[PDB]
Ligand SMILES: Nc1ncnc2c1ncn2C1O[C@H](COP(=O)(O)OP(=O)(O)OP(=O)(O)O)[C@@H](O)[C@H]1O
Ligand SMILES: Nc1ncnc2c1ncn2[C@@H]1O[C@H](COP(=O)(O)OP(=O)(O)OP(=O)(O)O)[C@@H](O)[C@H]1O
Ligand SMILES: Nc1ncnc2c1ncn2[C@@H]1O[C@H](COP(=O)(O)OP(=O)(O)OP(=O)(O)O)[C@@H](O)[C@H]1O
Ligand SMILES: Nc1ncnc2c1ncn2[C@@H]1O[C@H](COP(=O)(O)OP(=O)(O)OP(=O)(O)O)[C@@H](O)[C@H]1O
Ligand SMILES: Nc1ncnc2c1ncn2[C@@H]1O[C@H](COP(=O)(O)OP(=O)(O)OP(=O)(O)O)[C@@H](O)[C@H]1O
Ligand SMILES: Nc1ncnc2c1ncn2[C@@H]1O[C@H](COP(=O)(O)OP(=O)(O)OP(=O)(O)O)[C@@H](O)[C@H]1O
Ligand SMILES: [Mg+2]
Ligand SMILES: [Mg+2]
């Protein structure tokens with residue numbers, strides 16, 4: 001029983017960690033699609049795919065969880081997008097998404113789609129995180145320590161302020 | 165330290181497993197670049213990228229090993245291919261390859277490149293394992309049991325036979 | 329003589345039918361270009377290239393026109409676009425378009441470009457048709473019965489409402 | 493019921509014409525996929541997609557049949573190729589092909605795949621027709637008259653001879 | 657010593673000329689990256705790469721300057737964009753740009769990056785030029801004569817006005 | 821009066837130098853298309869586009885010529901190639917090639933095409949030069965000294981011998 005979720009994870013935060021813990025109550029293994037994999041060094045997408053993969057893996061590695069952090073390019077072709085994801089991932093059974101498009105594409109191919117729970121959405125939000133990194137407000141408590149680590153290694157806050 | 169190897173892994177086999185254990189005695193973490201990610205459904209590359217990530221993760225999940233199985237697509241552009249691999253992966257320090265083009269691209273970018281030891285190459289080689297699959301000889305002792313399970317799940321031997 | 333027209337046809341409607349009837353009075357054959365062929369599943373482009381080819385072909389098949397419905401992707405490259413379109417289509421003599429870009433690229437290559445007559449544009453427009461599909465007003469009498477048929481087969485109205 | 497065949501058709505010949513008339517006794521409509529769409533001006537692929545559309549449509553306008561001559565690019569990605577073919581084509585139910593790859597991809601997605609009959613393959617062959625066109629032998633009896641006509645209009649034999 | 661600058665040059669105006677003469681006081685040769693090289697026939701990007709190379713060349717040829725006008729496509733992948741640029745260009749030692757993204761990408765690759773001086777930026781700006789071309793407000797005394805000559809050969813002002 | 825020639829220049833050798841001096845007696849300016857611009861680090865294409873631009877510009881800068889060394893990518897689409905080449909380059913009138921595909925593509929668009937003169941074609945050939953580099957014969961006296969110098973900066977012979 002595998003599940004799939006997809007996000008940009010810029011960065012992976014504590015709401016992601018919670019929803020993955022919840023989904024790991026329902027399914028044996030979780031595929032973690034890293035969308036917009038080619039997008040990096042922008043204000044919405046500050047981090048590369050390999051940065052994201054490192055954040056995610058370093059966050060989840062001591063949990064008793066089988067997961068697959070897989071980079072998925074933006075391709076501009078919605079009608080083949082489910083097959084493109086399938087090409088790159090282990091077979092899976094359930095998709096967790098609240099996004100109208102991801103839900104329509106997967107349901108027309110016969111998959112089950114479920115809406116995940118949101119946890120503390122006024123704080124646990126890439127958009128809100130990046131906004132605090134830019135304005136000097138105190139964001140480290142919003143993501144896993146492993147992500148803090150990574151963001152320091154690559155100087156990601158500095159990157160984001162330079163790009164602004 | 166982080167190490168880098170790249171192969172097609174069709175399929176991951178006991179010689180890979182051995183070379184990766186040996187690598188891990190040099191370096192803290194290993195990036196496993198899955199090459200020709202887009203090539204599947206052929207006699208030389210039967211399995212999809214996603215099929216390969218499943219095989220590799222199921223084989224290794226086992227060990228006290230931090231590794232990152234990351235699909236890299238054939239791009240036709242040798243001069244930016246180190247950059248492309250660097251976009252998709254955690255920062256790495258040492259490249260294990262005997263392949264002359266991989267070696268030349270990495271060395272010209274300032275990376276140290278080592279040859280890995282071969283283990284038992286007359287059996288442990290994807291070409292030899294695929295040939296055995298096609299003709300109905302035993303191959304399952306040549307890969308980790310977790311690979312045997314995967315190949316059964318995805319009906320990999322039947323695909324090969326049909327393609328032939 | 330062969331005329332060329334290009335639109336997105338989401339969906340093909342009675343205006344498109346009339347303007348093609350008008351054009352087949354001037355030229356022996358018509359190439360129907362189906363623009364933005366890779367776009368689908370969006371409120372502006374709900375339907376795939378294949379669904380549009382089916383709509384168009386099922387509308388025009390009883391009419392005794394020779395016509396070629398040909399899918400044309402969005403490429404990002406206006407300077408080569410005429411050549412792209414010429415690669416995919418019979419040789420043609422006249423383009424009918426009132427689009428300033430289509431018009432400019434064809435004229436720079438030496439083609440004759442003519443404006444097509446508009447029929448009943450406050451009703452005969454994909455925008456106004458998708459808008460009624462969405463907001464529940466009747467739209468069936470604005471397209472050919474074959475198009476109503478195809479949209480039923482594929483449940484395109486539900487698709488659109490789910491995407492909104 | 494819709495059928496699906498795929499070839500390169502350089503050019504469309506009387507073997508195709510007969511394989512299609514035969515298919516048309518099993519199914520209501522037939523999607524003709526024109527494979528290698530972007531390949532032209534070579535000795536194996538002299539003719540552009542649009543030149544093949546014109547040939548195939550002129551040959552068949554003739555008959556009491558509904559067909560869909562649809563250009564399909566060579567994408568280098570076998571895992572997504574059925575989806576890609578599905579994005580560009582009306583829904584179909586049966587695939588006629590003896591090609592071992594096409595047969596696998598379709599069967600893995602649930603489709604029924606049948607071998608078409610061959611007719612007179614030692615003459616009715618693109619390869620043998622191209623050979624005759626280059627060396628000044630009679631080839632006009634091997635294709636529809638509609639084809640010959642197209643070949644004259646685009647000067648295809650002259651092309652092929654200068655390429656050689 | 658070799659300097660790099662990048663712009664769209666639609667069109668090269670006197671602001672450009674002066675910033676290049678300045679840079680030439682620091683460096684022996686100047687690579688002029690003509691970016692967005694595939695973008696043309698739009699109100700932001702009116703001219704082709706080949707047109708911009710002929711504007712830029714005709715404007716510098718009688719200065720004592722060694723330069724290299726080299727078209728650079730928009731790729732959608734920031735992370736490998738310095739390697740791409742390096743692929744197409746002679747090796748350079750200093751980058752002049754005040755664009756933050758350009759600056760961040762080249763600084764993470766260890767290059768020295770310097771802001772160029774602005775000259776007369778209310779008149780000497782492509783956006784202002786194209787807006788006068790479009791309004792009938794005047795423009796030729798904002799770019800080199802050579803750029804005027806060119807904009808006349810190709811009829812660029814008419815093009816822009818038809819696109820509007 | 822501008823002339824166009826296209827080759828891979830790996831590397832630019834004394835036959836290239838002659839044939840371009842010849843062509844410069846017939847035409848006011850020469851566009852040197854550097855084909856296979858993305859191909860590098862192979863035995864047929866050792867050098868990157870920017871490496872070849874450097875070779876070609878070092879070789880000619882002390883002669884009389886007006887020229888434009890412009891990188892052209894291998895696209896895989898013969899029917900649009902002439903338009904792609906036109907996007908990238910100043911307008912040209914005369915094409916010098918003895919290649920049958922280059923010739924056909926351009927004569928089908930109405931261009932005059934002429935065969936250039938061979939000079940010293942047993943020595944003055946990329947193939948022969950690379951072959952000497954790789955088995956140890958002398959090659960310097962076959963290419964201009966400015967090319968020798970470049971091949972030494974970038975250690976071009978070492979790269980080639982490593983790739984073999
Ligand atoms: N009502 C009409 N009468 C004649 N020509 C029409 C009519 N409506 C559309 N066309 C046109 O057909 C082509 C564009 O079709 P397209 O499907 O994109 O049109 P639309 O109805 O305007 O769609 P949309 O509102 O979704 O943008 C152009 O030739 C345009 O002239
Ligand atoms: N706080 C949260 N609680 C539960 N799931 C969440 C939460 N935040 C995001 N997700 C899930 O993560 C995936 C979207 O990841 P994504 O990168 O878009 O996150 P985000 O927090 O919305 O960031 P952004 O503001 O940058 O868009 C979706 O599956 C969404 O369900
Ligand atoms: N038996 C082996 N022992 C050690 N390393 C191996 C062995 N087989 C392959 N490798 C290596 O793993 C990578 C090669 O991966 P790949 O799957 O492409 O090899 P392969 O088994 O030789 O495959 P194939 O026969 O399908 O080409 C390189 O690092 C090469 O060193
Ligand atoms: N003589 C024939 N009789 C029946 N079907 C044919 C014949 N030749 C080709 N086909 C069919 O057409 C399709 C392949 O078309 P394609 O254009 O590749 O034909 P071809 O004649 O084999 O060309 P080529 O020699 O140039 O490779 C397949 O479905 C194949 O069965
Ligand atoms: N007026 C100016 N004076 C000095 N430098 C300028 C001026 N305008 C632009 N630049 C510089 O030239 C390059 C920008 O070129 P680009 O074509 O993008 O410029 P632009 O004049 O801002 O055009 P546009 O408004 O269309 O975006 C950069 O190196 C930038 O520093
Ligand atoms: N010895 C030569 N004398 C004259 N022209 C030449 C000579 N060699 C090549 N050319 C010309 O240069 C262009 C071919 O460039 P290209 O770099 O492909 O040449 P090449 O020397 O044949 O290389 P290669 O062997 O690597 O294919 C053509 O326009 C051809 O006319
Ligand atoms: Mg979000
Ligand atoms: Mg191998």
Ligand SMILES: [Mg+2]
Pocket residue numbers: none
């Ligand atoms: Mg419109």
Ligand SMILES: [Mg+2]
Pocket residue numbers: 618
């Ligand atoms: Mg064939």
Ligand SMILES: [Mg+2]
Pocket residue numbers: 782
């Ligand atoms: Mg600007």
Ligand SMILES: [Mg+2]
Pocket residue numbers: none
């Ligand atoms: Mg040659």
